[PDB]
């Protein structure tokens, strides 16, 4: 509530949200010789060392990270906590049996600690997290995040049909369990609840009606589901909800579109669906790694810009094979090159930080070093491979340095992770 | 000569095969294995209890229990002088490739980067690579010198390039003949070293230079041939505009006598039916380079069609354009490229491509690629539990195929604990 922390090094952030990718250059700030001052888990002051250093009393030691890159904490807008151990239709062989283990509270506790360590080790300070059907396991996840005062959005999976009996809830149990978790965890410190129907195929009309009820009763909770990942899933949803005008219309007619409504994947959207997401101000989680690993297809980021739809990056751990947001951006580059779309390092860095924060409606809280922002940040270095150090040494522009961090970065690039203005992870 | 004795869990493929479904039958796992090495070759291989009596008391067993031991990985397309490269047209070549390669005109730079290049292969468990050198012959000597010091089986050559590129990087048809010949004489079958005649590709080689490449292959029948083929539609159109009297891109190389046994074509993303059949008939080899194919948006190599056409395929990192030396990450990208074609790459097929399959594509499968008696002792000690996420996923895998899938497609350089070349330890993880 009191003492100042002073962090010195080279900082990169985007200073405001934008509407066109061509505007990112104008919003990007690089301070090679920067100073970040932290008070009460927030940015007190940020800018040039020479402009700010006079504020540092002799009673305080400077944390010197000169030679490293310091960026805002990465934002993962779609990840499954109970799928860390998962290795490769898919649902019945892999997802469901893996998730089954998280009924054991002691397993859920151990894996909550492992899950949070994996995010911090990868520089992820905020995530929108799929829990389990089991509410004990969402408690374990929130308890782990709560210990370090992490800003995390999570929820109990709602799933009453078309899956194994060991993983089914009911419409009613899914209402009461979600409400009780909302009551314990929503706006509990920096924690936030998302109403999390797995997706249309595994939720009865009765359960969709409960999800709608929860959103009506708790207007400031998040909504988090899957949307149009694969053509079979879309066909299956149309066959189960034939009176609705396609997949998104199911969620829309049940009042689950709007501000802080996050749809994962959105690979195979109709024109009408793109416009609905735009009009509702609903959010997409672009999950390139799983989209390639399952051969789901190529997310049209160009169209999302055209349609002014909020996009954040998701790892979709489980189906995606990395926690790392730099590797996720690398896969985004690959997905986009196959569409002849050239993802700039500026745009990638935007999507990983303030862009994703905007997609979760948290851009007033995190995502750059503006005064008043929550002090979540990552000390990075290009030391992952000798090849990364070589390419970084041969880089002179900020775009080239960002590019080397994106294309050859992994967990070894993350030196330190700060959550709530406190050191919560060192590499070693 | 004296014996070395290696103990731990081994996996290899014991014979080349015709279908991916046949690999399972050729796959050998020995949990408690012993490998005996004499004169850089496999003296004896099999169960610890069947072989340990042959271990004289004068030598210590190298005990790698808890690790997996595999044959050294084969990288069938990589550019030595492009490690430091950072970057809607093949003016990728003009902005990135050509300026980067220009630095390797300094012999002292080329020597420093030869040492770095070899270190990066060993650190990633690559023991054999088919390497694009420089246009400069003193820089190919640097590369061969470095490989020679540890008696590596490496295939490399001087790049031939007389046109359509910056002046600082052009040779001539004649200089390209004499330079290549001199390197062939110094290095081809010098220990385990092998020369490849390396015209960069059709666009950057005059008819006169293609005529020299043809001449060298005629004069040196047991050298390799190594070029690029049909990576992207612009490149193909450019080749058709420069060689309009030839029946497409591959016909250029074929009419100049550069197809056949030990002729390796990198990429082959955009092959016509006629081109697939020509490579098949000629017994020519493809280097599948998924990572660069994705980074440059070249497209998706049709591995299914290569199986249908009985065309040898090996994996290439295409460093430069690719971002990793690591064969496990390369196989990961291969899995992704193939899933977009609804082709499911099994662990068996990934493991096969990285080892005996790639060795077959380079014509080296009688020399390397498994632990059969008489094979060259190039192998990698792997810790597939090297990171906590890897330990978790491996522990949670029940079958050999699931473990091999985690080890072979979701590992990185941290998985490589020890690399052995010519039966000697040449790399330990720090
Ligand atoms: Zn998901
Ligand atoms: Zn190449």
Curated annotation (Swiss-Prot), chain B:
The keyword Glycoprotein does not apply. Keywords: Hydrolase, Metal-binding, Zinc. Its cofactor is Zn(2+). SUPFAM superfamilies: Composite domain of metallo-dependent hydrolases, Metallo-dependent hydrolases. The keyword Lipid biosynthesis does not apply. Its EC number is 3.5.4.3. Pathway: Purine metabolism; guanine degradation; xanthine from guanine: step 1/1. Gene3D superfamilies: Metal-dependent hydrolases, Urease, subunit C, domain 1. Binds 1 zinc ion per subunit. GO terms for molecular function: ammeline aminohydrolase activity; guanine deaminase activity; zinc ion binding. GO terms for biological process: guanine catabolic process; guanine metabolic process. NCBIfam families: guan_deamin, PRK09228.1. Belongs to the metallo-dependent hydrolases superfamily. ATZ/TRZ family. This is Guanine deaminase.
């Amino acid at each position: 509530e009191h003492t100042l922390k002073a962090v010195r090094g080279s900082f990169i952030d985007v200073t405001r949200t934008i509407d066109n990718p061509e505007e990112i250059a104008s919003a990007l700030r690089f301070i090679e010789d920067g100073l970040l001052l932290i008070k009460q888990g927030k940015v007190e002051w940020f800018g040039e060392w020479e402009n700010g250093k006079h504020q540092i009393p002799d009673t305080i030691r400077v944390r010197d990270y000169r030679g490293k890159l310091i960026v805002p904490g990465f934002v993962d807008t779609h990840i499954h906590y109970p799928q860390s151990e998962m290795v490769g239709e898919w649902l019945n062989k892999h997802t469901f049996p893996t998730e089954r283990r998280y009924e054991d509270l002691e397993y859920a506790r151990e894996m909550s600690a492992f899950f949070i360590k994996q995010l911090l080790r990868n520089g992820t300070t905020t995530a929108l997290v799929f829990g389990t059907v089991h509410p004990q396991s969402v408690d374990a996840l929130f308890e782990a995040a709560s210990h370090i005062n992490m800003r995390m959005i999570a929820g109990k999976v709602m799933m009453d049909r078309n899956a194994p009996d060991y993983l089914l809830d009911t419409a009613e149990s899914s209402y009461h369990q979600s409400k009780e978790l909302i009551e314990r965890w929503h706006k509990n410190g920096r924690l936030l609840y998302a109403i999390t129907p797995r997706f249309a195929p595994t939720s009865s009309p009765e359960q969709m009606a409960m999800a709608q009820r929860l959103k009506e009763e708790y207007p400031d909770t998040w909504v988090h589901t899957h949307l149009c990942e694969n053509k079979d899933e879309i066909a299956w949803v149309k066959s189960l909800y034939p009176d609705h005008d396609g997949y998104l219309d199911v969620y829309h007619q049940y009042g689950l579109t709007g501000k802080n409504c996050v749809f994962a994947h959105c690979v195979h959207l109709e024109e009408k669906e793109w416009d609905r997401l735009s009009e509702t101000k609903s959010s997409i989680a672009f999950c390139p790694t799983s989209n390639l690993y399952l051969g789901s297809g190529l997310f049209n980021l160009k169209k999302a810009w055209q349609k002014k739809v909020k996009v954040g990056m998701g790892t979709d751990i489980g189906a995606g094979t990395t926690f790392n947001m730099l590797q996720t951006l690398n896969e985004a580059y690959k997905v986009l090159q196959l569409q002849g779309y050239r993802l700039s390092a500026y745009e990638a860095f935007y999507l990983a930080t303030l862009g994703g924060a905007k997609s979760l409606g948290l851009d007033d809280l995190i995502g750059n070093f503006l005064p008043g922002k929550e002090a979540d940040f990552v000390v990075m270095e290009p030391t992952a491979t000798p090849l990364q150090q070589l390419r970084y040494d041969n880089s002179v522009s900020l775009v080239d340095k960002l590019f080397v961090m994106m294309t050859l970065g992994d967990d070894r690039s993350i030196y330190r992770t700060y959550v709530d203005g406190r050191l919560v992870y060192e590499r070693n």
